[PDB]
Design a binder for this molecule. Structure first.
Ligand SMILES: NC(=O)N[C@@H](CC(=O)O)C(=O)O
Ligand SMILES: O=C1C[C@@H](C(=O)O)NC(=O)N1
Ligand SMILES: [Zn+2]
Ligand SMILES: [Zn+2]
Ligand SMILES: [Zn+2]
Ligand SMILES: [Zn+2]
Lengths: 337, 343
């Protein structure tokens, strides 16, 4: 019965993969979102303007007629990346941002890429950060918190004009850090980190389809993220981190990290905001806060969500194997009209 | 290559399942261990003397010719269990101990315990007759974080229970935390513990970094490294009320590598060499025999075995999988090179 009309959203953190998987997954995004930040962690990664241009066209080829979807491309930062290559892609309108993955082709130190980061700061290119330390001796649940202290804060103190998105935050540590930051710091939050905590992944069985990075944390962290979005804080915004893997790559002796949440993310977010008595802040999170941070216009079309329960498919067909969507088989309280 | 000769060990915490799975898994235990505590969590659970007798015989049927193996049976504690039935099974030598799984108010009374307070008549009977209680010490309330469930049990259940029933003998099964290590270390002659090979060898990082590894997923869940280190130090200390209990808990590969993987490591094939590796790494091999072969018997009031087995420090590869009638089992350390093996 209840209908909610919002400005068309964007997805500020998306994995589209390549090849046949790209063809399968793109429509779940392109049917809903005006734009998406397309992450560069292909094999091999997108580290040049030329690769980014070709990847963008493969994406556009897979977008159904009648969907007005624009992929915003990113550069995968590497220790040896030429700042001129990054800048050129920015100037050509190819790279919207650059993405920093901690090694384990990722970045091994901030110090190794200082000239690149200094160029980004100068030109006004946002830096998107997967904020975890990776030393083998650090417990996995501690890696996000540890990153703040040892990498993020020294970085932000060194390059004070650099615009940073703390991607897919999962902790009270990160939530407080972002809440207390300045207008050059923002964050994205996935639906899974709002909806669940580590118990949902581990109690009653191990659930690889809830296994993603940064790892689901303790309930107190989930609650902190929920309070953050619900507060109306305007430097957090929608980034699904939809990260699809074939079923038997997920369900194996060593399951891949990532939730394929593009089919269900928007309605899942609506449920969270509704539960937090915060639907007044829902549009901004989905459709305004991101554009404002990135300095891009808001979308000029509108969509409607309706509060009628849809069951999520058990699986989605691939050329080989299937794809198991996030919330497969379950019910979602809101759907797109 | 180096040889380690020990009195034949026993496994004080074992799942043997039933039917065809039992037939496949029993030999991995019976070739090595003289005795094992056979857990009662069948479907339906072993809650009567008659079921335990029949289950014991199915286990004996599946022991290969010449293995000297004796299953020690257990009763699954439930709300509906008659204390007279438990006593009779103990008196008759059928039940060696009884096993308490986590309480849950929604459990069927035929299948488990609603709250510990509700089964005090059976626990009082065990205390009275000197029957040991084996405890899977977790609280499973939905609002308790899974990594906290063992510690919460100590505070909410274990300590009050032992204060209530001061003569009750208890094994804190498969301990996984420094909380439990300290608790058991600081306890009296009526409190003991078992520790699995996976909880000594690994911590939660091994299960979650670089991938999710369902073959390391078991209950109680692997904890952070500080807890692993506490467990290692406890066994390394020579503390004589900790002993070998594998919690070998086999599930078919398709039930492990699924959208909702079952909890349990099939470690019977590789457990003994794994414990040898841990004790060696802790420079504590002088305590290894006692852990495997002496401490358990002493706590249960049973004789130590009078035959010997030898482990050799020679590298061997663990099978990738072990055929079942249908599907396959993936052993603990599948495909790995291990340092110690049985001669
Ligand atoms: N988050 C995930 O668990 N997976 C992402 C990587 C990422 O966002 O780090 C992927 O590309 O598979
Ligand atoms: O408590 C338990 C039960 C056991 C089993 O599978 O029987 N598996 C476990 O991982 N621990
Ligand atoms: Zn990431
Ligand atoms: Zn991502
Ligand atoms: Zn148990
Ligand atoms: Zn067990």
């Amino acid at each position: 019965s209840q209908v909610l009309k919002i400005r068309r959203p964007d997805d500020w953190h998306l994995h589209l993969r390549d090849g046949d998987m790209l063809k399968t997954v793109v429509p779940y995004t392109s049917e809903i979102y005006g734009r998406a930040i397309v992450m560069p962690n292909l094999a091999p990664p997108v580290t040049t303007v030329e690769a980014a241009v070709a990847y963008r066209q493969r994406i556009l080829d897979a977008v159904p007629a009648g969907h007005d979807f624009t992929p915003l491309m990113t550069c995968y930062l590497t220790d040896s990346l030429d700042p001129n290559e990054l800048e050129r892609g920015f100037n050509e309108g190819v790279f919207t941002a650059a993405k920093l993955y901690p090694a384990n082709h990722g970045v091994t130190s901030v110090d190794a890429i200082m000239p690149v980061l200094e160029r980004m700061e100068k030109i006004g290119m946002p830096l998107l950060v997967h904020g975890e330390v990776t030393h083998a001796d650090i417990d996995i649940f501690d890696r996000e918190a540890r990153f703040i202290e040892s990498v993020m804060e020294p970085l932000r103190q060194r390059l004070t004009a650099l615009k940073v998105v703390f991607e897919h935050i999962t902790t009270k540590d990160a939530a407080d850090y972002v809440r207390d930051g300045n207008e050059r710091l923002a964050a994205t939050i996935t639906p899974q980190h709002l909806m669940f905590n580590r118990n949902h992944m581990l109690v009653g069985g191990v659930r690889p389809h809830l296994y993603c990075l940064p790892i689901l944390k303790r309930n107190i962290h989930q609650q902190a993220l929920r309070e953050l979005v619900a507060s109306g804080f305007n430097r957090v915004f929608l980034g699904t981190d939809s990260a699809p893997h074939a079923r038997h790559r997920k369900e194996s002796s060593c399951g891949c990290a990532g939730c394929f949440n593009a089919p269900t993310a928007l309605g899942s977010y609506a449920t969270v905001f509704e539960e937090m008595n915060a639907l007044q802040h829902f549009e901004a999170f989905c459709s305004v806060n991101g554009p404002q941070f990135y300095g891009l216009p808001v979308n000029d079309t509108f969509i409607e969500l309706v509060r009628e329960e849809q069951q999520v498919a058990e699986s989605i067909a691939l050329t080989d194997d299937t794809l198991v969507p996030f919330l497969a088989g379950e019910t979602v309280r809101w759907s797109v009209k």
